[PDB]
Amino acid sequence: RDQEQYIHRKCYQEFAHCYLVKYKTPQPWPNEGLIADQCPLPGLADVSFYPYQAIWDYYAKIENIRPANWTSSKLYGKARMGSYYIPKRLRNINNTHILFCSDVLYSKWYNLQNSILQNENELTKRLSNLTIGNKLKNRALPYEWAKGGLNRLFRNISVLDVCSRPEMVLLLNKTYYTFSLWEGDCNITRYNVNETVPECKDDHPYSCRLWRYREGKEEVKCLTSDHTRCLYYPEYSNPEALFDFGFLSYMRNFPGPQCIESTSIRQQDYEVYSIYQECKLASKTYGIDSVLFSLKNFLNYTGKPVNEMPNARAFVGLIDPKFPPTYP
Ligand SMILES: *[C@@H]1O[C@H](CO)[C@@H](O[C@@H]2O[C@H](CO)[C@@H](O[C@@H]3O[C@H](CO[C@H]4O[C@H](CO)[C@@H](O)[C@H](O[C@H]5O[C@H](CO)[C@@H](O)[C@H](O)[C@@H]5O)[C@@H]4O)[C@@H](O)[C@H](O[C@H]4O[C@H](CO)[C@@H](O)[C@H](O)[C@@H]4O[C@H]4O[C@H](CO)[C@@H](O)[C@H](O)[C@@H]4O[C@H]4O[C@H](CO)[C@@H](O)[C@H](O)[C@@H]4O)[C@@H]3O)[C@H](O)[C@H]2NC(C)=O)[C@H](O)[C@H]1NC(C)=O
Ligand SMILES: *[C@@H]1O[C@H](CO)[C@@H](O[C@@H]2O[C@H](CO)[C@@H](O[C@@H]3O[C@H](CO)[C@@H](O)[C@H](O)[C@@H]3O)[C@H](O)[C@H]2NC(C)=O)[C@H](O)[C@H]1NC(C)=O
Ligand SMILES: *[C@@H]1O[C@H](CO)[C@@H](O)[C@H](O)[C@H]1NC(C)=O
Ligand SMILES: *[C@@H]1O[C@H](CO)[C@@H](O)[C@H](O)[C@H]1NC(C)=O
Numbered sequence: 001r002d003q004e005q006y007i008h009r010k011c012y013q014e015f016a017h018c019y020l021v022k023y024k025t026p027q028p029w030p031n032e033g034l035i036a037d038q039c040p041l042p043g044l045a046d047v048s049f050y051p052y053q054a055i056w057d058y059y060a061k062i063e064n065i066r067p068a069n070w071t072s073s074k075l076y077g078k079a080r081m082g083s084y085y086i087p088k089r090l091r092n093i094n095n096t097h098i099l100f101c102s103d104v105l106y107s108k109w110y111n112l113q114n115s116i117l118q119n120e121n122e123l124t125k126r127l128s129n130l131t132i133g134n135k136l137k138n139r140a141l142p143y144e145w146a147k148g149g150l151n152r153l154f155r156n157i158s159v160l161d162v163c164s165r166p167e168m169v170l171l172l173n174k175t176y177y178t179f180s181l182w183e184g185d186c187n188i189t190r191y192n193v194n195e196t197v198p199e200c201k202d203d204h205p206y207s208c209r210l211w212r213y214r215e216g217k218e219e220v221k222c223l224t225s226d227h228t229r230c231l232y233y234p235e236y237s238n239p240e241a242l243f244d245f246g247f248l249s250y251m252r253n254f255p256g257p258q259c260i261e262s263t264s265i266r267q268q269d270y271e272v273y274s275i276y277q278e279c280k281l282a283s284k285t286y287g288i289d290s291v292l293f294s295l296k297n298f299l300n301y302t303g304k305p306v307n308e309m310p311n312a313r314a315f316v317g318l319i320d321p322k323f324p325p326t327y328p
């Protein structure tokens with residue numbers, strides 16, 4: 001009780017929301033380009049109309065002026081300009097586990113409106129119940145992550161999660177679903193929306209319309225003698241420079257087109273370990289000081305501590321880590 005509540009205090013304040021997901025088979029995010037129209041773009045103005053979207057870190061921004069032989073494949077690989085480039089580091093076939101310290105994935109029983117007393121009580125009570133040792137029972141997870149999943153600990157990831165927790169989605173999503181208003185996708189063109197979209201057959205200005213239109217080939221045209229400052233012509237245009245068209249289409253403000261295609265990324269059940277539960281159990285055998293020291297170094301497996309990262313972004317890949325760690 002005295003040493004149990006002391007171990008709980010230390011284990012909770014440090015590792016309450018820290019978990020280790022093991023992929024059945026190491027499977028990285030399969031594409032270099034991400035189509036996520038549900039997220040608003042940064043916009044041309046100095047001050048954006050939307051608060052910073054973490055996904056903007058991966059934005060393949062179109063610049064109107066580029067050197068004579070500039071192509072998008074130099075910085076953004078196969079990604080479409082105007083959408084997102086997923087860097088090498090977030091699609092590493094060597095990563096076998098996903099370490100994260102975050103409370104953004106809890107289901108409805110956890111929320112800020114509740115006092116910290118209620119949240120802490122309910123989380124430790126669910127962690128005890130939903131674990132065999134330090135391993136979470138399948139019922140704690142979403143069904144998509146593991147068969148028999150009932151969201152008793154973690155909620156399902158949603159369409160907007162990638163806008164604010166991009167690494168969580170790239171690393172944990174079992175399926176990639178596009179959200180697209182790009183002309184050509186799902187065979188929807190500016191000419192056939194009156195046939196592909198049932199709710200349309202001709203109100204909000206954005207009704208029955210695509211966002212980005214198919215222009216043609218990507219090219220750099222040098223009109224003047226300056227060969228370091230030529231006219232860039234992208235494959236697609238944003239004709240009215242709209243930055244939240246897709247976000248408003250998602251938030252169901254009006255009728256019109258939407259293209260949602262799925263790509264299976266990870267197959268087979270995840271294994272999830274609770275680092276608070278591991279802390280609580282290993283401290284009875286090795287002592288709180290060595291368990292706290294060891295689990296802290298485990299959170300620094302990459303050189304940057306995961307518990308010191310912002311909650312929305314504290315999702316990192318590890319290569320064949322030894323868990324539980326060696327306790328001195
Ligand atoms: C990371 O992981 C996250 C977790 O998995 C993931 O989140 C999930 O994201 C997906 C993708 O956005 C979400 O699913 C979609 O939900 C759409 C909305 O559904 C509601 O509205 C519909 C419209 O009225 C209802 O039908 C629908 O009811 C159904 O679902 C209920 C549960 O939600 C269920 O209880 C009901 O019984 C019922 O079955 C619900 O109320 C939905 O519209 C969408 O469906 C399309 O896309 C699917 C995937 O490709 C297709 O399988 C499906 O058939 C639909 O495709 C059609 O429509 C598209 C346009 O919307 C077209 O592009 C397609 O080509 C296709 O169109 C053809 O067929 C039409 C008729 O079927 C026809 O009219 C057309 O002409 C054409 O022939 C899909 O289910 C999911 O809900 C999210 N999960 C959670 C928990 O939030 C996240 O996205 C991932 N992130 C990243 C970055 O990858
Ligand atoms: C999280 O995602 C899972 C899917 O992976 C959701 O579970 C599924 O939810 C649907 C809609 O409620 C269930 O469909 C219903 O099934 C009953 C019969 O079981 C049927 O009578 C209804 O007509 C309807 O089709 C589906 O059973 C269920 N699937 C599984 C495997 O559980 C879940 O609801 C999402 N969680 C939350 C909290 O949003
Ligand atoms: C651009 O490409 C052409 C064709 O390969 C080449 O001849 C030319 O020197 C390049 N321009 C510059 C400014 O390097
Ligand atoms: C994966 O590990 C192997 C062996 O150490 C290495 O050759 C390869 O470059 C690594 N891949 C990435 C994407 O770092």
Ligand SMILES: *[C@@H]1O[C@H](CO)[C@@H](O)[C@H](O)[C@H]1NC(C)=O
Binds near residue numbers: 128129130
């Ligand atoms: C977990 O909680 C449920 C709900 O009270 C209960 O039925 C179940 O027996 C509990 N499991 C354990 C390990 O006590």
Ligand SMILES: *[C@@H]1O[C@H](CO)[C@@H](O)[C@H](O)[C@H]1NC(C)=O
Binds near residue numbers: 186187
């Ligand atoms: C788009 O058209 C091609 C045939 O030209 C077809 O194979 C493909 O499945 C269509 N896609 C959709 C989503 O309708």
Ligand SMILES: *[C@@H]1O[C@H](CO)[C@@H](O)[C@H](O)[C@H]1NC(C)=O
Binds near residue numbers: 300302303304305
């Ligand atoms: C994480 O490890 C690196 C060595 O790779 C070290 O420089 C850094 O101080 C460690 N962080 C902590 C909190 O000890």
